Every structure is written in C-alpha cells, then in structure tokens.
C-alpha cells in the first residue's frame, strides 16, 4: 500500500499526532507568549514556503490555459463558470440565512454576558466597493506583484490613497487573462511565448512536489500551535450555539446541495469525485488559504479524476479568488446572530436586503488583508448596527475560517467537472481544427 499511498498516510498521521502533542503540552506545561511563538517555527516556515509559489504558478497557469483554447471557446467556458459560481453563491446565502433564523441562536443569550476582543477596522462602503475596481486595473505591473491599493476619507471630505504590502491577485489574474487571449490569436508570432509559459508552468508544478516532502512536519507543528494559543474554553461554551449554526450550514451545503447539482448536470457518483481530493481537503483544512492550496488542488483534480487540463488551468485559478460560498454563508449567519443578540426585529424585507448586501459584500472584499472584518462591517452598517459589535465573533474567527476553505476547494473541483462536461462538444472538436 506504500508508495501507492505515502503522502496521504503521512498527512493523516501528522494531523492525528499534532492534536495529541498540542493537547498534552498546553495541559501539562506552561509556556510564555514568547515561547509559544518559537514552538510554531516549522509551521511558519512551511507557510512562507507555500506563499512563494502563488505568483508564478497563477500567472503561468492562467496564460497557458487561456492561450490553449480558441477565442470563441474561451468566452463560453468563462460564462458557464461565472453563472455557476453566481448561482451556487446565491443558493448558499439563502441556505445560511434560513438556517440561522430557524434555530434562533441569540434569543436567550444577552450581549452583556458575552465578552469581546479584537480591533475593528475602518471601513467605508462605497470606497471599499470602488477599491475592487481600482485593484482590477493596477497602475504598475511589477508593483502589483506585492502591493495593493487602499483609499481613505480624510480632511468637506477628500479621498487619499496609498499602497500597502499584499499580493494583488485580482489584477494579476485579469492581466494574465487578457495577455493569454492576445497571444493566443497571434498564431506563429506568439508560439515562443506560449512555449516559455508552458515550460514555466511545468517547472513551477515540479517544485511543489519537493515541498510536499517537508509538508507533514510543518502540518504537525502547525496544528499543534493552534491548540496552545487558544485563549480559554469559557468563550467556546459561551459561543457554542453560534459555531453550531455555521458548521451545520457548511456541512449541509457540502454534503447535499453541491452533490445534488453535480448529479443533476453529470450522471456520475459524486462521492468518489470528492474522495479523490481528500489530500486537497486536508490541505485546505490545515493551511486554510484557498490561494496557497492551489497546486495541491491541481494535482488532485488532474491526476485522480482524469479531468481535462485545459479546463482546470482555466477554471481553478479563477475560482481561487472569486468563489465566496463559505465566506458569504458565515457572514450572513453572523450578521443575523448579531442582529438577534441586540434589540432588533428582522422583517421579510429586512431579511431580503440583508441577504442581498451580504451576497454583494462577500465578493466585494475579494482580496483584503482581513476580508472577514470588512464584509461583516458592511452588512451591519446596512442593517443599522455599528461596527463595534463585530468583536464578539473575533474570539472564534480562527476556527471557522479553516472550515470554509475545504468547502471552497471541493466546490471548485465540482464546478471544474461540471464545466468540463457541459462543453464536451467543443473539447472534442477543437482537436482537429
């Protein structure tokens, strides 16, 4: 069974051992705030090794995927992917809103009992909405690789902007799409660029395999460190009802709705397909970064489910930044919970508008240093409540952030399969013309 299955067995063993190690250390030992940071050094090294692959992999994969297809074919695949993402995001938002209202988590609990912590960021609705369009078209290609644009209101008020560290993935993806479309129609005059980017994509994909050898140790030291820096278990019991709603919504959306759509569109068993990405699911659960888990998703989808490369290379990078299913559901549930906690009554129109604004703001903060805080604040401002009540959820915002990634990755795989099957005619016809 070994060699055939070594990476998955090592990852499972490391995940099992890390929880035990972390529980034992915290229980029977006392560590200072400085000593708790040196215990997670291998995890940080793994995190900053995985962050180094995102730029070349994304750029080369997007260019290669776009340039391979014809101009007429690419638009149809993009339209299908966009429609599927939008529809399932709407479905997830609806499911989350109804689920939190039905159970009624914050009817009994009062705001006074619950403590709060964290720093609420400064947020402007229209400014944040326009910052997305600004970041879609960066002023500099080199600066876009490690900086982002932000604007703030100051002084009867003026608008001033500045650049801050953080990879701009939206602008890079848009430019890669445009460049691939341009060089795909040049014919012979762009073949050198096509070959260069194909070789770069292959070389980048071969480097992740080296990191996969060190991955189990970093995973073991990464999950143990999360169970040593936990503040206390009092807040977990004080917020147990809140976590139940989000977890139930995520589980329902992952188990019922997505396989239902997959079985309706394509006539295949949807559970073996999900099993084929188990390593990707564990990677998403631990690292909890949809962008950093991209190479593992590529390897799992292409090698284990026989999905066409020309479909993954175009769909998966796009889905790495645009899919908002987990984010939108969590934000909607948390906003309704905060509204229930305070003296606010939710009507039908209020529910509809809060769902609409949650759906819009989930994708509005597509790329932000702390996007979960921006989206919640916008929804709370829309409903009336201030941004100072977001600090209640921050105490458990490190546990529910990990669960969303696996759902997003699994849904991206399902959408890749659905889009590949939905355009089978042009995939079997472009091979000869």
Residue numbers in the entry: 14 to 168, 199 to 476
Please give me the paper's original passages concerning this structure.
Human excitatory amino acid transporters (EAATs) concentrate the neurotransmitter glutamate and aspartate in cells. By coupling the uptake of one substrate molecule to movements of five ions—symport of three sodium (Na+) ions and a proton and countertransport of one potassium (K+) ion—EAATs ensure that the cytoplasmic glutamate concentration is ~10 mM, which is required for neuronal functions, while the extracellular concentrations are as low as a few nM permitting rounds of synaptic signaling. EAATs are homotrimers composed of promoters that work independently. TMs 1, 2, 4, and 5 of each protomer comprise the scaffold domain mediating trimerization; TMs 3, 6, 7, and 8 and helical hairpins (HPs) 1 and 2 form the substrate-binding transport domain.
EAAT3-X was predominantly found in OFS in NaCl buffer and iOFS in NMDG, NaCl/glutamate, and KCl buffers. Notably, we observed no K+ ions bound in OFS determined in KCl buffer and assigned the state as apo (described in detail below). Surprisingly, when we examined the OFS conformations imaged in the NMDG chloride and KCl buffers, we found that they closely resembled OFS-Na+ with wide-open HP2 gates. We observed no density in the K+-binding site, suggesting that potassium did not bind to OFS even though it was present at 300 mM. We term these nearly identical structures (RMSD 0.57 Å) OFS-ApoNMDG and OFS-ApoK and refer to them collectively as OFS-Apo for short. Strikingly, the YE/DDR motifs of OFS-Apo are in the bound configuration, while their NMD motifs are in a configuration intermediate between apo and bound conformations. Inspection of the Na3 sites in OFS-ApoNMDG and OFS-ApoK revealed distorted geometries of the ion-coordinating residues, including shifted N366 sidechains. We found excess nonprotein densities at the sites, likely due to water molecules. In contrast, in OFS-Apo and OFS-Na+, E374 is buried and proximal to G415. It is likely protonated with pKa-s of 9.2, 10.0, and 7.6 for OFS-ApoK, OFS-ApoNMDG, and OFS-Na+, respectively. OFS-Apo features an open HP2, protonated E374, and bound-like NMD and YE/DDR motifs.
